Amino acid sequence: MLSERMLKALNDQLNRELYSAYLYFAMAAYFEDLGLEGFANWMKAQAEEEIGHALRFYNYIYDRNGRVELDEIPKPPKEWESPLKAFEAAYEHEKFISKSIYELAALAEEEKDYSTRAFLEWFINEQVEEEASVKKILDKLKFAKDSPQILFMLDKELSARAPKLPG
Amino acid sequence: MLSERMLKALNDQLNRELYSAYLYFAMAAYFEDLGLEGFANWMKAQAEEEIGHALRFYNYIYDRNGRVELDEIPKPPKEWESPLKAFEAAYEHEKFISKSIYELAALAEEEKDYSTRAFLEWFINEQVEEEASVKKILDKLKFAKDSPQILFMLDKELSARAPKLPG
Amino acid sequence: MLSERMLKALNDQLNRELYSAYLYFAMAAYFEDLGLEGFANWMKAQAEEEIGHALRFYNYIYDRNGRVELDEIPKPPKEWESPLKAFEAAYEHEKFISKSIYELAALAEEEKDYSTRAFLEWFINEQVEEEASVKKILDKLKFAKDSPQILFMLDKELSARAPKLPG
Amino acid sequence: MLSERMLKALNDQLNRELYSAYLYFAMAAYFEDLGLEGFANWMKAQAEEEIGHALRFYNYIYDRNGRVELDEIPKPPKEWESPLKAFEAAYEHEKFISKSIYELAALAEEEKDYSTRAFLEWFINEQVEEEASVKKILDKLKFAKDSPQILFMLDKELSARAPKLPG
Amino acid sequence: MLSERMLKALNDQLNRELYSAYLYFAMAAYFEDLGLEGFANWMKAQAEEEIGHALRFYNYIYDRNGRVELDEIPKPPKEWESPLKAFEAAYEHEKFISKSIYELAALAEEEKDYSTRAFLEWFINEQVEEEASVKKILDKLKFAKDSPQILFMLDKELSARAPKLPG
Amino acid sequence: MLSERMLKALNDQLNRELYSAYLYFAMAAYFEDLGLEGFANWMKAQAEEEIGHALRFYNYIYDRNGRVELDEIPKPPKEWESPLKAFEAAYEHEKFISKSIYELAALAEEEKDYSTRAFLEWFINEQVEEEASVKKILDKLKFAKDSPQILFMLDKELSARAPKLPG
Ligand SMILES: [Fe+3]
Ligand SMILES: [Fe+3]
Ligand SMILES: [Fe+3]
Ligand SMILES: [Fe+3]
Ligand SMILES: [Fe+3]
Ligand SMILES: [Fe+3]
Ligand SMILES: [Zn+2]
Ligand SMILES: [Zn+2]
Ligand SMILES: [Zn+2]
Ligand SMILES: [Zn+2]
Ligand SMILES: [Zn+2]
Ligand SMILES: [Zn+2]
Ligand SMILES: [Zn+2]
Ligand SMILES: [Zn+2]
Ligand SMILES: [Zn+2]
Ligand SMILES: [Zn+2]
Ligand SMILES: [Zn+2]
Ligand SMILES: [Zn+2]
């Protein structure tokens, strides 16, 4: 009841979700280097979120009697020219995630796989939130061009989102 | 501060920690496919603990004015002949991770880098617990040779260890 | 990420929701004039619900990086031959809102805009409830054809539903 | 609002759902005879759930202004070869139900009936869970093969899911 | 310990009880269609109660080390000429179950099966209540011949009895 | 108790207040697009306040045995040159609502309509407040001519005022 193609598509997205976690952990390291602790914790918190998304693929796969197969998680970028560029890369990446979700949806429909299509709805909706939440901070960063002081207030704002795990 | 050498080593161990998380996750998938849910959650909680180890390194690197750099995380193995052998693999893996920390401690000593050596004390003590805790379940698995009854009983026992993340 | 046609379809529906609100408000004034406070309050409530529905479109548009544009809200009918007929109007209107949601859904499907189709799923479900609730009352007003004592009893039953805004 | 065909199909499913209630009640009786109270209760609980599923259909039909019509509910099988074969037949049954939901979902997509399709989503997702929890127990049963000890421990484990009605 | 004939006659009644539920379920549909939610909900609660009667037999059968066997459940009528007539049908049905119970108690007496006669005492008392409670609504319904207003008010009263299951 | 003149004047102001709501809603959209979420929520809060003003007129018309008649609501402006320009437009709207109210005061005194004039005393006092609260912010925006720093700190202050209804 998972086709061979579907299963592979699902394990691929699971791998994509794990890669996103690593990308954000990477940006976390990057902002930590800048001394933007607030940004760093925001990004660690976003990594954990992505781990969560992978678990959803992981559970659905097992629920349909599939087998999960873990793949390498690529080396994420080390650096960005700026917090702005880093968020632009996050936004570009979220768009990439979405695109792959639509393709999975398109695949489920093409296979008349109602179950998988339906499981994907959650992701279609989540990605809307994901894209908006990155874009919002991205635009705020545009708005703070030659302004250290704003970057600092944004940092302080963003420190409100802390990773759950270190506890 | 940190020599260039010391920092490559810390970074490299950091990625070993991340690799273990991933290894344990793979073991989790393996047990899950076997319908051993208790084993699977124990492995996921282990996975999480490894992320915590990574983060200790991450934090120490930054305290010392260093820069985390994150490498690819190689595809773990997908499969094992048996619950027992999975745990034999885990026990070997912790043994290896303990050899890594010895190596790193020795490097610290050679460099007269007291701080890193001090930092590593925590891991020398942690690894004693890690190895011991893996050994306990391994022996129980040896004890359960050809007795599904006991395997079932062990699955339940280990279901008392849960990943904090899902909620 | 919203097509120019879609943003238009969405802004239009938003507007349609505000006009629903205004119509129900007109119906409140009608009942208020008949001294049927229970009906009048019920409509003030529905009016608020509809504003809510509009706000949902507004939020979604901004989330997908869109721009809401507000249009004129047309003058609603002042008067109805009777309670029953007013509810006959309200029902038909709900059916018109329903068909315009279905056309948006179909548009989203034509365009392969999965986000927008997933968002419309909420309104598809909502309208099922909306029609069923106007129909239930419509039907009791049929059953009270020339029997004021029942009209009086319904009015009291519907005062159960309060508009939230006055306090 | 409901095509004559859609209604026939919805009522058809409603009846499938009661038959499921009844089939699980047959199995409950079967397990009670074997002296397996845990299994038996699990099934009574499942029977209740299926009645819940029929009510989901009843309510949707009335929201949509159609008319429920009840049919005869066939005699279920009295007996199975073993706990395992009984759970295999439940698994096959759940598969047959899932296929009924899909065919219905298809019918709705063909009729451009967006309200009925949206209604059915709940069941699409529900069936995933349904098939999954039968499977999980069906494997627990395969893994018992020649072991009263384990079937006993399973019976106890399942006794934790109790039917509500008795209260 | 139960005679073949007794065992059939108990299982026979089990099936008669389940049919009751099924019949009350039809009436609930019937009322529901008419717009009378109170009467509908009353009938579902009644249906729910009849399932409890089936169960009492079921448990008694296994208590006596017998084996329940479930038979087809006939299609109930779809419609009645009026709520009163539906109530007349329910009254006539409860009168039917009672006789069934008297006949059952008689056979137990003839066969000198004290235990089953003892078990049936509960039903003899229950039917008095069953029959009385239906008659009472039946009469209130006679009292309301050509009066909608009372059908309304009655409906409201009945609504106070709610089926447990949906919760 | 109301002159055909008064009834018209009041219905007119009713309609003016409703257009006010819409004007501020439009402005909320303008700010939302700027990514100024505080400003946008403040404008929604102001929007709901205007609907309140609307209701006040409504209730009063009905207390004097009048009949409310709703008019079309004109399309408001889509945009402004700047946050400052938008508040200059807002202020200048409040002055126009003020003048409108003063004219009703005069109209009601012109025909010795004591009740309506005393009713209006609430609005004369409310408008003093409305204008001061818009002026306060308008000035604050002047004082921050070219200063994203300050425009950002302001946005944060105004976020403390939230629309009530979402809920
Ligand atoms: Fe998210
Ligand atoms: Fe440990
Ligand atoms: Fe609603
Ligand atoms: Fe379920
Ligand atoms: Fe009773
Ligand atoms: Fe004010
Ligand atoms: Zn994700
Ligand atoms: Zn994401
Ligand atoms: Zn470790
Ligand atoms: Zn370890
Ligand atoms: Zn609406
Ligand atoms: Zn509506
Ligand atoms: Zn079902
Ligand atoms: Zn089911
Ligand atoms: Zn009974
Ligand atoms: Zn009865
Ligand atoms: Zn005002
Ligand atoms: Zn104002």
User: What is the Cα–Cα distance from B73 to A154, expressed in whole angstroms?
Assistant: 32
What single DSSP character describes residue E82?
Answer: S
Rg of chain D over all Cα atoms, to the nearest angstrom:
17
CB contact under 8 Å between D112 and C106, yes or no, is yes
- The identity of residue B157, as a single letter, is E
Q: How far is CA A130 from CA A126, A127, B128, in A?
A: 6, 5, 41
CA distances from E150 to C67, E34, E147, E157, F73 (A): 55, 15, 6, 10, 45
Q: Helices B83-111 & B114-143, crossing angle to 10 degrees?
A: 160
Give the minimum alpha-carbon distance from D86 to chain A in angstroms, rounded to a whole number: 20
Cα distance from N-terminal residue to C-terminal residue, chain E: 40
**In the C/E pair of chains, how many CB contacts fall below 8 A?**
14
Inter-chain touch C115–A128, beta carbons under 8 Å: yes
CA distance E65 to E70: 17
Closest CA to D129 of A5, A115, A13: A115
CB contact under 8 A, D72 and E73: yes
Q: Distance from the CA of A132 to the center of ligand 7, in angstroms?
A: 13
Nearest CB among D48, D70, D166 relative to E25 is that of D70
Rounded to the nearest angstrom, the minimum Cα separation between E89 and chain D is 17
Query: How far separated are the first and last CA of chain F, in Å rounded?
Result: 39
Domains located in chain C, CATH noted:
1-167 (1.20.1260.10)
Interchain CB distance below 8 Å, A22 and B75: no
How close does chain A come to C55, measured CA to CA in Å? Answer: 16
Query: C-alpha angle with apex D117: D112 to D118, nearest 5 degrees?
Result: 125
3-state helix, strand, coil in chain F (%, to 5): 75, 0, 25
Distance B109 CA to ligand 18 centre (A): 74
Strand partners for A89? none
Our CA-based measurement puts residue D150 at a distance from the nearest CA of chain B, in whole angstroms, of 6
Please list, in sequence order, all residues whose beta carbon lies within 8 angstroms of the beta carbon of residue C124, skipping any fewer than 6 positions away: C101, C102, C105, D114, D115, D118
Q: Which residues of D are annotated as a binding site for Fe(3+)?
A: 17, 49-50, 53, 94, 126, 129-130
CA-based nearest residue to D105, from D92, D94, D121, D93 = D121
How far apart CA C37 and CA C23 sit, in angstroms, is: 17
For chains C and A, tell me whether 3 or more CB atom pairs sit within 8 A of each other: yes
Contact check, Cβ <8 Å, A153/F152: yes
Q: Which of E120, E78, E70, E119 is nearest to E98 (CA)?
A: E120
**Which tokens is F102 given?**
């003063």
Q: After which residues are there C–N gaps above 2.5 Å in chain F? A: none
Ligand 13 centroid to Cα of residue A137, in Å, is 45
CA–CA dist E23, E15 (Å, integer): 12
CA distance E77 to F6: 63
Contact criterion met (CB below 8 Å) for A121 and A5: no
Contact between chains at D63 and C105 (C-beta distance less than 8 A):
no
Please name every residue paired with E73 in a beta bridge, in sequence order, or none if there are none. D73
How far apart are the CA of A73 and the nearest CA of chain B, in angstroms? 5
- Measure the CA–CA gap between C94 and B92, rounded to whole angstroms: 67
User: How far apart are the C-alpha atoms of E35 and E39, rounded to whole Å?
Assistant: 9
Q: Is F65 left (phi over 0), alpha (psi -120 to 50) or beta?
A: left
Distance, CA of C80 to CA of C74 (rounded, Å): 17
Q: Is A53 exposed, middle or buried (0-12, 13-18, 19+ CB in 10 A)?
A: buried
Q: How many residues are recorded in chain E?
A: 167
CA distances from F132 to A42, F22, F40 (A): 39, 20, 19
- Give distance in angstroms: CA of C78 to centre of ligand 11: 20
Torsion of CA D108, D113, D117, D120, to 10 degrees: -80
On whether the CB atoms of residues C17 and C61 are closer than 8 A, the answer is no
Residue F98 CB contacts under 8 Å (≥ 6 apart), including other chains: F127, F130, F131
CA–CA distance, F151 with F167 (Å, rounded to integer) = 29
CA of A138: how far to CAs of A94, B107, F111, F159, in Å? 12, 42, 60, 20
**The two three-digit tokens of residue C65, written as one number:** 């990086």
The CA-CA-CA angle for residues B126, B131, B134, to 5°, reads 125
Chains that touch C (3 or more CB pairs under 8 A): A, D, E, F
Instruction: Give the C-alpha separation, C150 to D37, whole Å.
Output: 53
List CB contacts (< 8 A) between C51 and chain F: 165
Phi and psi based region of residue C35 (left: phi greater than 0; alpha: psi -120 to 50; beta: remaining) = left
Helix (H, G, I), strand (E, B) or coil at D66: coil
Q: Do C70 and F25 touch (CB under 8 A)?
A: yes
- Asked if A53 and A107 count as a contact pair (C-beta separation under 8 A), the reply is no
Strand partners, D73: E73
CB E76 within 8 A of CB E26: yes
Angle at D69 between CA D66 and CA D75, to 5 degrees: 150
Strand partners, B78: none
Nearest to C16 by CA among C87, C85, C95, C128: C95
Report residue D29 CA to chain centroid gap.
16
Q: Which residues of A touch D (CB under 8 A)?
A: 1, 60, 63-65, 112, 114-115, 118-119, 121
Six-digit token string for D6 = 């859609």
Q: Do A102 and A87 meet the contact criterion of CB atoms below 8 Å apart?
A: no
Per-residue b or e along C100-122, where b marks 16 or more CB atoms closer than 10 Å to that residue's CB: bbbebbebbeeeebbbbbbbbbe
Please give the sequence-ordered ranges of beta strands (E in DSSP) within chain E, or none if there are none: none
Point out the ligand nearest to the CA of residue C123. 11
Tell me whether residue B126 is annotated as binding: yes
What are the chain D neighbours of B149 within 8 Å (beta carbons)? 147, 149-150
| Chains C and F touch, using 3 or more CB pairs below 8 Å | yes
Residue B121 known to bind ligand: no
Q: Are B156 and B40 contacting, i.e. CB atoms less than 8 angstroms apart?
A: no
What is the distance between the alpha carbons of residues F74 and D37, in angstroms, rounded to a whole number? 71
Q: How far apart are CA F167 and CA F159, in angstroms?
A: 17
Residue entry with tokens 């009335």: D62
Resolution in Å equals: 2.8
Instruction: Give the C-alpha distances (Å, rounded to integers) separating D8 from A7, B18, D75, E23, E33.
Output: 35, 57, 22, 20, 16
Question: What are the respective helix, strand and coil percentages of chain C, to the nearest 5?
Answer: 75, 0, 25
What distance in Å separates the CA atoms of residue F42 and residue B32, rounded to the nearest whole number?
51
DSSP class of residue C81?
A: S
A48 bridge partner residues: none
Contacts of E11 (CB under 8 A, 6+ apart): E57, E61, E68, E69, E71
Q: Which whole-number Å values give the CA distances from C133 to B22, E36, E166, in the listed order?
A: 53, 14, 20
For CA atoms E98, E103, E107, E109, give the dihedral sign.
Answer: positive
Separation between Cα atoms, residue D158 and residue D152, nearest integer Å: 10
C-alpha to C-alpha distance for E104 and E98, rounded to whole angstroms: 10
The nearest alpha carbon in chain C to D63 belongs to: C132
| Distance of alpha carbon B26 from alpha carbon B18, whole angstroms | 13
For chain C, helix (H) and strand (E) counts, in that order, are: 5, 0
Indicate yes or no: CB of E29 within 8 angstroms of CB of D68. yes
Residue whose token pair is 């009672």: E98
Residues of A comprising the binding site for Fe(3+)?
Answer: 17, 49-50, 53, 94, 126, 129-130
Structure tokens at A101: 């979700």
Half-sphere exposure of C91 (CA within 13 A, CB side): 18
Note residues around ion ligand 10 (Cβ under 5 angstroms). B 130
E158: part of which helix (H) or strand (E)? helix E148-158
Task: Measure CA E2 to chain center.
Answer: 25
| DSSP bridge pairs for F73 | C73
The pocket of ion ligand 16, defined by CB under 5 A, consists of E 130
* D/C touch flag: 3 or more CB pairs below 8 Å: yes
Alpha helices in A81-147 (DSSP H): 83-110, 114-142
DSSP E81: S
- Nearest-angstrom CA–CA distance, C137 and C143: 10
**B and C adjacent (3 or more CB pairs under 8 angstroms):** no
| A50 min Cα distance to partner chain F (Å) | 26
Residue of E nearest to D26 (CA): E70
Three-class DSSP category at A73: strand
> Would you list the DSSP string of chain B?
---HHHHHHHHHHHHHHHHHHHHHHHHHHHHHHTT-HHHHHHHHHHHHHHHHHHHHHHHHHHHTT-------B-------S-HHHHHHHHHHHHHHHHHHHHHHHHHHHHHT-HHHHHHHHHHHHHHHHHHHHHHHHHHHHHHTTT-HHHHHHHHHHHTT---STT-
Inspect the interface and report whether the beta carbons of D135 and A64 lie closer than 8 Å. no
**DSSP label at residue C77:** P
Nearest residue in D to C95, CA atom: D1
Count of alpha carbons within 13 Å of E148, Cβ hemisphere only?
A: 15
D85 CB contacts (<8 Å, ≥6 apart)? none
For residues D118 and E155, what is the distance between their CA atoms, to the nearest angstrom? 32
Nearest to D124 among A1, A64, A118 (CB): A118
Q: Find chain E residues with C-beta within 8 A of C144's C-beta.
A: 148
Q: What's the angle, vertex CA A163, arms to CA A159 and CA A167, rounded to 5? A: 120
Instruction: Characterise C90 by phi-psi region: left (phi > 0), alpha (psi -120 to 50), beta (else).
Output: alpha
Would the annotation count B92 as a binding residue? no
Q: State how far the Cα of E44 lies from the Cα of E161, in Å rounded to an integer.
A: 9
Q: What is the CA radius of gyration of chain F?
A: 17
Q: Could you identify the residue written with the tokens 């699977």?
A: B40
Residue A48 CB-half CA count within 13 A: 20
- Alpha carbon E90 to its chain centroid, in Å, reads 8
Token digits for A156? 């302080």
- From chain F, the residues in CB contact with A155 under 8 A are none
How far is the C-alpha of F24 from the C-alpha of F91, rounded, in Å? 11
- CA angle centred on A66, ends A60 and A68, rounded to 5°: 80
Please classify residue E114 by burial: count the beta carbons closer than 10 Å to its beta carbon, then call 0-12 exposed, 13-18 middle and 19+ buried: exposed
- Tell if the CB–CB gap between D105 and A114 is shorter than 8 Å: yes
Residues 6+ apart with CB under 8 A from E143: E150
For residues D33 and E70, the answer to whether their CB atoms sit within 8 Å is no
Distance CA B109, CA B13 (A): 17
Contact D105 A119 (CB under 8 A): no
Inter-residue contact C5 to C116 (CB < 8 Å): no
Q: Decide: helix, strand or coil at residue C73.
A: strand
